[PDB]
Amino acid sequence: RWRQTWSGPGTTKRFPETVLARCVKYTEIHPEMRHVDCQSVWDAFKGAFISKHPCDITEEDYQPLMKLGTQTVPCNKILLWSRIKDLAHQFTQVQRDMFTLEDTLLGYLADDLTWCGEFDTSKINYQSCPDWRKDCSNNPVSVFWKTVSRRFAEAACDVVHVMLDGSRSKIFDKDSTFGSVDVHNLQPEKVQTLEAWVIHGGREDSRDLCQDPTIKELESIISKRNIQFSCKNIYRPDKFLQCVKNPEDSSC
Ligand SMILES: N=c1c2ncn3c2ncn1[C@@H]1O[C@H](COP(=O)(O)OP(=O)(O)OC[C@H]2O[C@@H]3[C@H](O)[C@H]2O)[C@@H](O)[C@H]1O
């Protein structure tokens, strides 16, 4: 109508068929995911939020889905990222030097989608879904990404990398999922170093954003957990992706 229940956009159109097709396509491509039954995955995904109030979702709601989506990722090749999606994916696409949450079955299923249900019924709400800020944080989409981001950070070991958007006013944002979940769920016993790549947005090689106050906050939080912190500027992200493509690439 002219007034919806919630402030967020409604469930993505054909959400069930989309998630199911994504699960088929993923499990056709990635061999270690062939034990996976896609119907079972869809059932467990729906079970997490159908007939539930979309402001009352918990991590336990998603545990069936997580169990079914159990997947080993090489623990020393994890790339976290915050607010700079395209480059993180273009980078891992070149030769799978690293793995992001969207390279995992569950991350691939949900990327770019929105979903919610209703307390009273088993219908998907295609009209509107809770906004994290205005309506509630414990909504189906936010709780899903907290839960999966928590388990992905827990699986990391050795050197873990994070790409950060250096054109935001908060390069490191303590309120982002990276700042509120990932940094606190790396296991210090297993993780030697968190290495941030701060992605520049223009000019080229301007300031040294590894000196930015928020990066200094990040370094102190990480160092206080007994994990070493490293930071690198990527001044020209275009030149960086071409260098990744053209190994022994005459400047890379
Ligand atoms: N792939 C998505 C995604 N695709 C669309 N969206 C995604 N949220 C998180 N993820 C992944 O979870 C991670 C944590 O997300 P967060 O930083 O909270 O997203 P924010 O920068 O806070 O963006 C969150 C918003 O963007 C929508 C969600 O429907 C919505 O919540 C992201 O870095 C990304 O890896």
Q: Do residues 141 and 251 share a domain?
A: no
Q: Do residues 32 and 151 share a domain?
A: yes
Please report how the helices 15-29 and 38-49 are oriented relative to each other, as an axis angle in degrees rounded to 10.
140
Confirm if 140 and 115 have CB atoms less than 8 A apart: yes
Say how many Å lie between the CA of residue 66 and the centre of ligand 1: 18
List the end-to-end C-alpha distance of the chain, in Å, as a whole number: 55
Task: Give me the long-range contacts of 20-28 (CB less than 8 A, separation at least 24).
Answer: 22/108, 22/109, 23/105, 23/109, 26/105, 26/108, 26/109, 27/105
Q: Do residues 216 and 236 share a domain?
A: yes
Residue 58 CA: distances (Å) to CA of 42, 63, 104, 247: 18, 9, 21, 45
Residue with CA closest to ligand 1 atom 14: 177
Q: How far apart are CA 56 and CA 62, in angstroms?
A: 12
| Domain end marker among 155, 176, 200 | 155
Q: How far apart are CA 98 and CA 191, in angstroms?
A: 16
Question: Which atom of ligand 1 has the smallest separation from the CA of 100?
Answer: 35
Say how many Å lie between the CA of residue 11 and the centre of ligand 1: 15
CB of 141 closer than 6 angstroms to any ligand 1 atom = yes
What single DSSP character describes residue 232? Answer: E
Structure tokens at 7: 């402030």
CB of 104 closer than 6 angstroms to any ligand 1 atom = no
Q: Do residues 25 and 67 share a domain?
A: yes
Q: Do residues 107 and 178 share a domain?
A: no
Q: Do residues 251 and 133 share a domain?
A: no
Q: What is the phi/psi pair of residue 159, to 5°?
A: -100, 120
| Domain end marker among 155, 177, 197 | 155
Say how many Å lie between the CA of residue 152 and the centre of ligand 1: 14
Q: How far apart are CA 112 and CA 191, in angstroms?
A: 29
CB of 222 closer than 6 angstroms to any ligand 1 atom = no
Q: How far apart are CA 246 and CA 57, in angstroms?
A: 45
| Domain end marker among 90, 124, 155 | 155
Q: Do residues 92 and 128 share a domain?
A: no
Residue 195 CA: distances (Å) to CA of 84, 116, 146, 217: 16, 35, 21, 14
Residue closest to 76 by CA, chosen among 180, 192, 178, 177: 192
Residue 250 CA: distances (Å) to CA of 205, 234, 237: 20, 18, 17
Residue with CA closest to ligand 1 atom 33: 82
CB of 15 closer than 6 angstroms to any ligand 1 atom = no
Q: Do residues 201 and 213 share a domain?
A: yes
Antiparallel, parallel or unpaired: β 8-9 and 128-129: antiparallel
The approach used to solve this structure was X-ray
CATH number for the domain including 166?
3.40.50.720
Say how many Å lie between the CA of residue 145 and the centre of ligand 1: 7
Q: Do residues 131 and 212 share a domain?
A: no
Q: Do residues 92 and 106 share a domain?
A: no
Resolution of the deposited coordinates, in angstroms? 1.8
CATH number for the domain including 131?
1.20.82.10
Q: Do residues 171 and 85 share a domain?
A: yes
Q: Alpha-carbon Rg of the chain, whole angstroms? A: 19
121, β-bridge pairs: none
Task: Give the distance, in angstroms, between the CA of residue 143 and the centroid of all CA atoms in the same chain.
Answer: 12
Q: Do residues 65 and 135 share a domain?
A: yes
What single DSSP character describes residue 181? Answer: I
Q: Which residue has tokens 């769920």?
A: 185
* Number of domains forming the structure of the chain: 2
Looking at the annotation, which residues are catalytic? Answer: 75, 157
Please report how the helices 38-49 and 140-155 are oriented relative to each other, as an axis angle in degrees rounded to 10.
120
Q: How far apart are CA 186 and CA 184, in angstroms?
A: 6
84-108 burial code (b ≥16 CB/10 A, e <16): beebbeebbeeeeebbbbbbbbbbb
- Determine the structural domain holding residue 229 and report its residue range: 73-99+156-252
